[PDB]
Amino acid sequence: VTQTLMNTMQESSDFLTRINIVPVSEMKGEKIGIGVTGSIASTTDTAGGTERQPKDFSKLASNKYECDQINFDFYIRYKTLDLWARYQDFQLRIRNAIIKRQSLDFIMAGFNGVKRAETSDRSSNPMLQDVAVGWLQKYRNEAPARVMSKEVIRVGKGGDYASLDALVMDATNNLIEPWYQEDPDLVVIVGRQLLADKVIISQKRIGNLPAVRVPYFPADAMLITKLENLSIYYMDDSHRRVIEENPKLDRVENYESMNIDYVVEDYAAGCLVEKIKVGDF
Amino acid sequence: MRQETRFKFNAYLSVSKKFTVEPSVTQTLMNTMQESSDFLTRINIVPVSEMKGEKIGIGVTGSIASTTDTAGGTERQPKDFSKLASNKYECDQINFDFYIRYKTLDLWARYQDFQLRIRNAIIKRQSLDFIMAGFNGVKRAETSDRSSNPMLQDVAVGWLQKYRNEAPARVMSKVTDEEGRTTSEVIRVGKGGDYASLDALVMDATNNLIEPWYQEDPDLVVIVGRQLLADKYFPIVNKEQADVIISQKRIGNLPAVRVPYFPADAMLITKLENLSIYYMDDSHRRVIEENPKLDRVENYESMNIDYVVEDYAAGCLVEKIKVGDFS
Amino acid sequence: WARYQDFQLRIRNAIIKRQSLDFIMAGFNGVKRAETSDRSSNPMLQDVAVGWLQKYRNEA
Amino acid sequence: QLLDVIISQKRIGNLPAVRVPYFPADAMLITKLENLSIYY
Amino acid sequence: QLLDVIISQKRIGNLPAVRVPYFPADAMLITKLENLSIYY
Amino acid sequence: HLSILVQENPLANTTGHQGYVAPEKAVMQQVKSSLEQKIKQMQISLTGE
Amino acid sequence: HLSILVQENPLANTTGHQGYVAPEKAVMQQVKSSLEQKIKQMQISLTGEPVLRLTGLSAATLPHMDYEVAGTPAQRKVWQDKIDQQGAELKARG
């Protein structure tokens, strides 16, 4: 029954409908990967000689994922539950509000989070870190070959580069894979503190490929990849939802929990750059 | 000349871009493979029905007109219509063969539409493999190992080695003197090297090496890898100031294309319909196997091909290109 | 050529293409009307007819 | 050199420039395109 | 000053700038356009 | 003038047919940058009558 | 620098909000024009030891462009191959 809820949630937002989200029936295993492997062809002197031995397919290097639980909590004061009940549109307003909050929450947690520390607090972590491991952290965590730090880069005049176009060119030439380097879906996504005049599809196109911004990002970074290499795996049937009408505090409570895990599929058809600042000398 | 040929010729007396013999199984697979990638679209994949013979002439021209005093004197001796430099191709087999582990297959079998995805994946895996093996691959050696040759340079002879061994004097790889047999090992291109820039290089190369017939032709391309293109176009964009020049990427007054895995230190100037691959009509043999000795389902597929560039005097390649300053 | 399909069309198109190219080649070249016209010592068609770039250089 | 048939966008002498397939590169001619003819 | 309702194309702080008819010119405020309201 | 006379030689421009900026513009941008850096790093002193 | 400090004053820009070019670019264009005029009207003399010693024009000799059979290295290689062919042929003679 969770599949229907997930489908409606993805259909609601317009950035989720571009990404793919899948249900997993098991807990921790092999990720679904149809990624292009290396060469497979060869020749063998079969007639009176050795044996034709095949080569592997979808070779695994490190593809272990363990879906963890997440949950959110409601608190609706009674003094408010009648206001929205007055204006002729109670149900639709409530439903749209809650689903939009949760949908944006997923994405906000996606591009952030650096650990899985239980008993999180919204005091020290406004952006919900400490909630899970996200893509932009999973990259740096294992195999940090697509991270660019070198000491901070300068897109200004007297820096290591001259304009962000040279930066994206060097990035898509040196770090991404060549067989993947030409694809009609290789898009760049850029934060807020970097755009000058160019989901929001922009008119111009840095490098030679289109640019787009999404509801959230880190402070100053950039991600060049396909819009299908990253995904979320949710447990098939683990979505619990209850509503408790306790008047001890004159309120209404709603508890809801699910089981998810973020993961990038190919991990070689994407690159990220961080610590980018517009500063000359 | 032959029975069917004489009949068809007598009938001739009294899409026009691709060749089809008859509806079969191998030809269909080759067509569906070609339709996948874009580079294979602009190339000729020809089915042939012989283990060894002569190559079909595509995109060959010449000067055939003349005038002779037939009135009391010499006679008219016609010139040959299609006589190339050397024309003898030899097709042979290559075979790719993989296996899927039981765990991964069991995982994939859950979500519907997995067979179609696997088919498309293996087709895409074969097309790029044809390309990568064709452009590399000096020589063919039985029992090809894949440890010290990761770029797949031991399957079969490639176009580059074809130019290297079949027709020299169309390849430049050293600057020499009448006394200095090797004055410089590599063709250095820089502010002080043997050339001003890549543009002058490709310009004088297309001026001298290739023949005057194809020299003046609306269809010529300079196939080059990815490293050299970026090395040329990076210092331009890395300036402060005219941003559309990245769209077409012309060098030496010639349109440029890039293909994956192309060797970084070489480039080849020629028309894109001059080089081609031939394949046997019915040799695509495929078998399955489900041995649990290593709990894996394997498959074996074999096809008989041969790469061939039609007219050697069409294009030329330069090798061992090194860019620097050379003070 | 006969093994494949529609070979007569290929032959017609190739021969017509060579014909059309050769007229232009002889157009901006050619300075004489010799009766032998050996295609060895004259790579471009230079001994087949008189051309525009020769009529200009000769008449006016 | 000194640059079917393709026309250059930038006029050299306020006149559009073209390139015919075969031509002695060291020379050039200014004229119309209907002025030439062949009679068969 | 310091520049119905008309929007300036060039964003000042990467944020689009607007001007409302009546406003104390020597001041300014950054906020959304739905955060304000009147209750009648 | 000597720098221009040197840069005009055909075996000087490392750039091909694309972006082959005239040597005048290049040397002018060079002198402009080298002068602007000095005018920016310096300051004004009041040791003049 | 003094000229810039003067031009930065508010009561300086003759042009209004349209075309209010920055004073830096204005004075830079001025100095560039007044310098290029001088560099164009002038010429280079020859009364200097390191310049009159061996420099000046390209060179002073007979063969510059007349033969240039080798020239570019590609043509050089073609001509060298043909010369080797001719030598292997003439080896039959004396």
Numbering used by the authors:
A (entry chain c): 37 to 186, 197 to 244, 263 to 345
B (entry chain b): 1 to 14, 27 to 253, 261 to 346
C (entry chain D): 120 to 179
D (entry chain D), E (entry chain d): 239 to 241, 262 to 298
F (entry chain e): 148 to 196
G (entry chain E): 148 to 241
Question: What is the paper's account of this structure, in its own sentences?
Answer:
P2 procapsids are assembled from pentamers and hexamers of the major capsid protein, gpN on a T = 7 dextro icosahedral lattice, together with the internal scaffolding protein, gpO, and a dodecamer of the portal protein (traditionally called “connector”), gpQ, at a single, unique capsid vertex. “Satellite” phage P4 is not a true phage, but rather a “pirate” mobile genetic element (MGE) —an integrative plasmid that has acquired the ability to utilize a “helper” phage, such as P2, for its own propagation. However, the Sid (“Size determination”) protein encoded by P4 changes the P2 capsid from its normal 60 nm diameter, T = 7 organization to a 45 nm capsid with T = 4 architecture. The smaller capsid fits the 11.6 kb P4 genome, but is too small to package the 33.6 kb P2 genome, thereby leading to strong suppression of P2 burst size.
